[PDB]
Design a protein around this motif. Structure first.
Motif, PDB file in Angstrom:
ATOM      1  N   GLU J   1       0.864  -1.206   0.000  1.00 39.21           N
ATOM      2  CA  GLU J   1       0.000   0.000   0.000  1.00 39.21           C
ATOM      3  C   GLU J   1       0.892   1.245   0.000  1.00 39.21           C
ATOM      4  N   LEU J   2       2.101   1.140   0.560  1.00 38.55           N
ATOM      5  CA  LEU J   2       3.049   2.285   0.536  1.00 38.55           C
ATOM      6  C   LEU J   2       3.108   2.827  -0.892  1.00 38.55           C
ATOM      7  N   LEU J   3       3.135   1.934  -1.879  1.00 38.78           N
ATOM      8  CA  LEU J   3       3.168   2.365  -3.299  1.00 38.78           C
ATOM      9  C   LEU J   3       2.016   3.344  -3.536  1.00 38.78           C
ATOM     10  N   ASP J   4       0.803   2.971  -3.119  1.00 37.78           N
ATOM     11  CA  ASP J   4      -0.377   3.841  -3.382  1.00 37.78           C
ATOM     12  C   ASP J   4      -0.607   4.766  -2.184  1.00 37.78           C
ATOM     13  N   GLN J   5       0.189   5.833  -2.075  1.00 44.89           N
ATOM     14  CA  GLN J   5       0.025   6.804  -0.960  1.00 44.89           C
ATOM     15  C   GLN J   5      -0.332   8.180  -1.532  1.00 44.89           C
ATOM     16  N   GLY J  25       8.731  -5.916   1.980  1.00 42.16           N
ATOM     17  CA  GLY J  25       7.644  -5.991   2.966  1.00 42.16           C
ATOM     18  C   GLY J  25       6.791  -7.230   2.779  1.00 42.16           C
ATOM     19  N   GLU J  26       6.252  -7.458   1.578  1.00 45.13           N
ATOM     20  CA  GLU J  26       5.319  -8.606   1.402  1.00 45.13           C
ATOM     21  C   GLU J  26       6.039  -9.927   1.701  1.00 45.13           C
ATOM     22  N   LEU J  27       7.291 -10.036   1.252  1.00 46.79           N
ATOM     23  CA  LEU J  27       8.039 -11.300   1.467  1.00 46.79           C
ATOM     24  C   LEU J  27       8.174 -11.532   2.977  1.00 46.79           C
ATOM     25  N   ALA J  28       8.670 -10.524   3.699  1.00 47.33           N
ATOM     26  CA  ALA J  28       8.767 -10.646   5.168  1.00 47.33           C
ATOM     27  C   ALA J  28       7.401 -11.082   5.702  1.00 47.33           C
ATOM     28  N   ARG J  29       6.329 -10.451   5.212  1.00 50.85           N
ATOM     29  CA  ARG J  29       4.973 -10.770   5.721  1.00 50.85           C
ATOM     30  C   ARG J  29       4.733 -12.276   5.597  1.00 50.85           C
ATOM     31  N   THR J  30       4.822 -12.818   4.383  1.00 52.18           N
ATOM     32  CA  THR J  30       4.518 -14.260   4.188  1.00 52.18           C
ATOM     33  C   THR J  30       5.433 -15.103   5.083  1.00 52.18           C
ATOM     34  N   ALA J  40       9.897 -11.525  10.443  1.00 46.93           N
ATOM     35  CA  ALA J  40      10.888 -11.667   9.390  1.00 46.93           C
ATOM     36  C   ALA J  40      11.347 -10.296   8.884  1.00 46.93           C
ATOM     37  N   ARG J  41      12.590 -10.282   8.390  1.00 47.22           N
ATOM     38  CA  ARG J  41      13.173  -9.052   7.794  1.00 47.22           C
ATOM     39  C   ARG J  41      13.899  -9.476   6.511  1.00 47.22           C
TER      40      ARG J  41
END
Lengths: 111, 153, 89, 27, 61, 208, 113, 111, 89, 108, 110, 112, 111, 27
Positions: J1-5, J25-30, J40-41
């Protein structure tokens, strides 16, 4: 002193001015650190940087003159003379140590 | 009786959610991080939850032996399992400074004649054992039957 | 190429142009409007009044903002030339 | 790296041969 | 073939000149502005593949 | 089997006639020369640097870009042929390989597909099945398209300067001045302060 | 100074200015980390970054001078000196360690001659 | 923080954009390093060399990592190795051997 | 081939030109008329302040409707070049 | 969502820096979603092209995981994390993915 | 998210972002259908689509990573693993099945 | 979605957008008809429509993935599976049936 | 579902749109006539008209899928299957009958 | 660096051979 100056808001300035100001600031900070050395009460650094070309025409190398005022009787160690040399040489792009002159308050060349 | 103790809040919450869904009464021991549940359901529930992925020497030995015994008992609640033996082999505090060690478990099951463990039951056993021992990865759990057939891939 | 690989580049270029020309046009319009309003308030009938304020305003704006616009344009052109080998594909 | 993978491959092969021998030698 | 080819490249110059004239920039040459846009057009619509195929069909038809 | 020496001399001296054609169609000369012509058009002055200087500079740039291919040809074809280790025809066939790879690396797929359609080619298969007579026109078409793509974006900053100067001049009021006359010195200033020539050569070399 | 120095940036900033400011900043952060070293009470870093030259017989190299003030009697160990060298060298693109000079508050060269 | 980049002006140039990217990377790397049990605070300095041109075989970047450990929390050899890997990966073309890791006492943990 | 076809293609061409140029010209005309009526209302008369917003409006016009023009003109040229070998005589 | 700010266009490079962040971000999330993983980082290093020579460098990734108090990751896990991270990055050779735990043990 | 995300009125957009949005939407719908499979409680799909060339001979193929969370004990059958593979591969132009990785909530590679 | 999706079209529509929208609409209508067959409660169609090229060595034909949810116990007939295949293949220019995958709500591959 | 249905959509319609709209209209009318056939309660026609490619040595041909819902028990005659085939094939420029698939509401292929 | 990896490889091989010998020599 030196870095503080470079900032002073100013618009009527030319590259030449920008360079001269950079030179002054470098001189100031170097003198500063030199004074911040135990035996040294005050320092004065003069840089001679040759105006550069963007062509292939004679490189040359810059020169520095350092005058130190010592604390009453605080003679500088051969190591003290050296470390000063190293610092000044490093702070100037392509400064060959042998072109750094260090002098005391009485006019003795510590170099 | 205690279903699980020493649970993370996350695991606890997940376990409580599952118990509620199954309509099983439960009592989370106050600040004991433990969940006492119907005594007659303890083992069945442990297994079921494991299927959903939830959650001195003498003492150690005893502890180890006790843990082994409990794990065996829990595994024996599986329909196809006549008997189970669990051996835990956590190396004594790594004496070697540089080399690194890791706990492992060997589970032997005697199956009822003509019965087999399915993939789900196998996975539940592996998870149960791994979760019970700190630092024991699932991959370090070997499950074999009475004939010595390796059930864990 | 693609209409987009072209429309995006043109949009970026005309952004750059708009940023370059915004200060001069803005000060010119403001100065002209101020002089015209002052003229109408006094009911002075003349058409050439605003030109000299316009020229001095534009001259002063150029002096003040020249380094900024020149640096922005130079940087934009430099990145365009650096990215040119990858534009073809 | 790759040596550890080769060693684990050897260990699995040896363990499976051992189990196959034990299976017939048990009854 | 060439005279029907010529039409879009003059259309672009016409619209460029009209747009320049709307804003009063009467002393801006339109050809210098139109040339990059004509190049952009000839890049976009496969300028050469379409022309090559059209000529080849023009023979075999 | 080998050709007679008289036949070899005849073929060798006849092949030198296609040297300008090879340089133009088969090498990087075409793209560089088109980009240079478009840049003069874009500078606002049509003939500031004489055609001779641009032609020589483009020749030097083409030689520098193609030096690895020339080295590969020399290692594969020229050297073993001159030592009398391979025949002339086999030397030519071996030496056509690095140039074929260079032409393929910059060839548009659509150009090759179209020129294979017009040559009745059916099951082509490996990228190493395209004949020279099919590969060459596709390479020329791709080079023309790429040169146009480079030129129309080289045009952009000078159009920006022209439009900005015209807008400022007319909005200020002086609508009777010719904007291009005032704009040309600023186009030269932009070209010299960016180092337009050096950066343009860098971009042209990197385009491969 | 340092990263904070590059905050209130007026539109009129020549590339030259942008570079000098980057230099000043890097110097500041390096001195900061050096002071954060236990025995070090204050540090001063001077960088000499000279844009390049194509001829080898006329090419020098980035150089650094580091002055440290130690806590009363807190002599720097050999390994410390080594770590200061590593940090300063890494923080400067293409800085050959041998061009890092480390000096104390009394003018003793802690690094090599 | 990556935040620094989000809150920014529109007059910033490419040089600024890059320097800001470098800073942000330095921040996040230090962050993850601290998030490692034995590490109380981390400080990462990156030296990413600019475009080549005047150079030939080009050159690669360097990193200096200073860690402050929890009272007595010595880093294991494997830890040191993992810090090296993370920092090297986070920097395009960073050869591990150019990552220096140092503790709060000035001991070089890498080499 | 027939003169009816020639005049039809010419008319369609120049209607395409009209569609391409109409948004920019109309936007400029509307801006000029609005600024003129505002000048008449305020009794302000300088011939240069009407030139300022016109450039900004026309340049925004390319931002908003530019992709549409670029897609229309390319489609026209593509269709013309594709139908070239069928209107030959 | 950072992309769409709701952010006005900045620059391609800015767009690039962002895209990189969002993927991280998404990779860490999964990776966190996975049972044993508490947080995860992910750090991505997309490679920079050269100047005149054709050299496609391969990107690299560093993954730090914080595991559920005590619980560890199985070898198959050490494999699935690798696969996911490698796939999410155009042309990421698994061998360039480093996985590390909260104690600094290299899991890969 | 998905097609709703792709639609959100927006003008300040480029071709690169436009594609990125297409990629996100495809990921979303694929995860959606995967969850809509009995044993699956939630799915997460990551696509790696390589940059396209208009002529460069060099040819590369995309890759996918699929993480599934199963219902308590709902192990996926082999035929299942196969159907997930097929769906993900088909949804991505030129996705070679062998480049689809399927993983569970515990980190087991199915 | 589908044909209705292509109604409120803003002037700013890139060819890319046009195409993607066409793909979406086709997917929608196909899923719709697949639901019309009795045993099917809901359908989901994914199309992968790509670039063609010419080198026979590397040709990737269009592909489709179809997920069906059946009514409680409504197993699909072999003939049914065949008809789904035919419909999906025909609806996609140059779709080779063998590139259509049909799967149920439990993850069983109904095709091959 | 209607020739006039798409006969609007304001303007700014990239020709791509003009074609897609034609395709939809043809589909609608064909389904309509198929419904008119007595035994047919509702029809659904899907056309795949390939967009010409200069990659293949010769041009490929289009395909059609026809789904019919019959009136309770109204089985279609062989001759009827034949007439549906003919109509759909003729309505599509260069549609080879063999590329027309006809299916019932139960998923039986009538073709 | 690499030498330590080789040494650890040798140590693991030696330890596994030792364990294999001990396994049969124990009963």
């Amino acid at each position: 002193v030196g870095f503080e100056l470079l900032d002073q808001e100013k618009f009527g300035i030319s590259q030449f001015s920008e360079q001269v100001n950079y030179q002054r600031a470098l001189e100031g900070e170097l003198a500063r650190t030199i004074e911040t050395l135990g035996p040294v009460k005050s320092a004065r650094v003069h840089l001679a940087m040759p105006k550069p070309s963007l062509f292939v025409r004679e490189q040359k190398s810059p020169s520095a003159s350092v005058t130190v005022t010592l604390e009453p009787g605080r003679a500088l160690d051969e190591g003290q003379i050296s470390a000063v040399v190293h610092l000044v040489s490093s702070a100037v792009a392509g400064l060959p140590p042998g072109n750094v002159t260090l002098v005391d308050q009485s006019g003795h060349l510590l170099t | 009786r205690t279903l699980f103790s020493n649970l993370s809040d996350q695991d606890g919450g997940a376990i409580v959610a599952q118990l509620t869904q199954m309509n099983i009464p439960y009592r989370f021991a106050n600040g004991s991080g433990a969940i006492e549940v119907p005594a007659d359901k303890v083992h069945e529930l442990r297994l079921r939850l494991a299927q959903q992925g939830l959650p001195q020497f003498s003492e150690q030995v005893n502890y180890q032996r006790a843990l082994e015994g409990e794990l065996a008992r829990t595994i024996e609640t599986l329909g196809p399992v006549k008997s189970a033996r669990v051996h835990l082999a956590m190396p004594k505090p790594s004496l070697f400074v540089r080399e690194q060690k890791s706990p492992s478990a060997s589970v032997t099951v005697t199956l009822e004649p003509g019965r087999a463990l399915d993939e789900g039951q196998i996975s539940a056993v592996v998870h149960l054992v791994s979760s019970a021992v700190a630092g024991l990865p699932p991959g370090n759990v070997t499950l074999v039957d009475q004939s010595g057939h390796l059930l864990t891939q | 190429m693609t209409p987009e690989s072209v429309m995006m580049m043109g949009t970026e270029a005309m952004k750059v142009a708009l940023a370059l020309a915004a200060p001069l046009l803005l000060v010119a319009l403001i100065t002209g409007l101020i002089i015209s309003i002052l003229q109408a308030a006094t009911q002075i009938n003349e058409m050439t009044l605003s030109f000299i304020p316009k020229i001095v305003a534009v001259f002063i704006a150029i002096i003040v903002a020249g380094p900024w616009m020149l640096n922005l344009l130079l940087d934009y052109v430099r990145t365009l030339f650096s990215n040119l080998p990858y534009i073809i594909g | 790296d790759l040596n550890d993978a080769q060693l684990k491959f050897a260990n699995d092969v040896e363990s499976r041969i051992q189990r196959r021998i034990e299976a017939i030698l048990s009854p | 073939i060439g005279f029907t080819i010529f039409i879009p490249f003059l259309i672009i110059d016409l619209v460029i000149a009209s747009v320049l004239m709307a804003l009063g920039m009467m002393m801006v040459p339109p050809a210098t502005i139109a040339l990059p846009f004509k190049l952009m057009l000839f890049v976009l619509v496969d300028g050469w593949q379409l022309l090559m195929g059209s000529l080849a069909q023009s023979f075999y038809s | 089997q080998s050709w007679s020496l008289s036949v070899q001399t005849l073929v060798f001296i006849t092949s030198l006639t296609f040297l300008p054609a090879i340089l133009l169609m088969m090498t990087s000369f075409t793209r560089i020369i088109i980009v240079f012509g478009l840049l003069r058009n874009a500078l606002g002055t049509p003939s500031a640097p004489p055609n001779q200087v641009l032609l020589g500079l483009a020749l030097f740039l083409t030689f520098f870009i193609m030096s690895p291919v020339i080295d590969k040809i020399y290692v594969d074809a020229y050297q073993p042929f001159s030592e009398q280790k391979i025949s002339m025809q086999e030397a030519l066939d071996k030496g056509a390989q690095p140039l074929r790879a260079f032409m393929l690396r910059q060839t548009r797929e659509a150009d090759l597909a179209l020129f294979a359609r017009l040559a009745n080619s059916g099951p082509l298969q490996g990228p190493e099945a395209v004949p020279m007579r099919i590969l060459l026109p596709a390479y020329v078409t791709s080079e023309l398209k790429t040169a146009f793509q480079i030129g129309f974006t080289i045009f952009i900053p000078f159009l920006i300067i022209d439009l900005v100067i015209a807008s400022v001049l007319m909005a200020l009021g002086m609508m009777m001045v010719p904007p291009a006359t005032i704009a040309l010195p600023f186009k030269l200033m932009l070209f010299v302060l960016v180092d337009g020539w050096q950066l343009l050569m860098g971009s042209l070399a990197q385009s491969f």
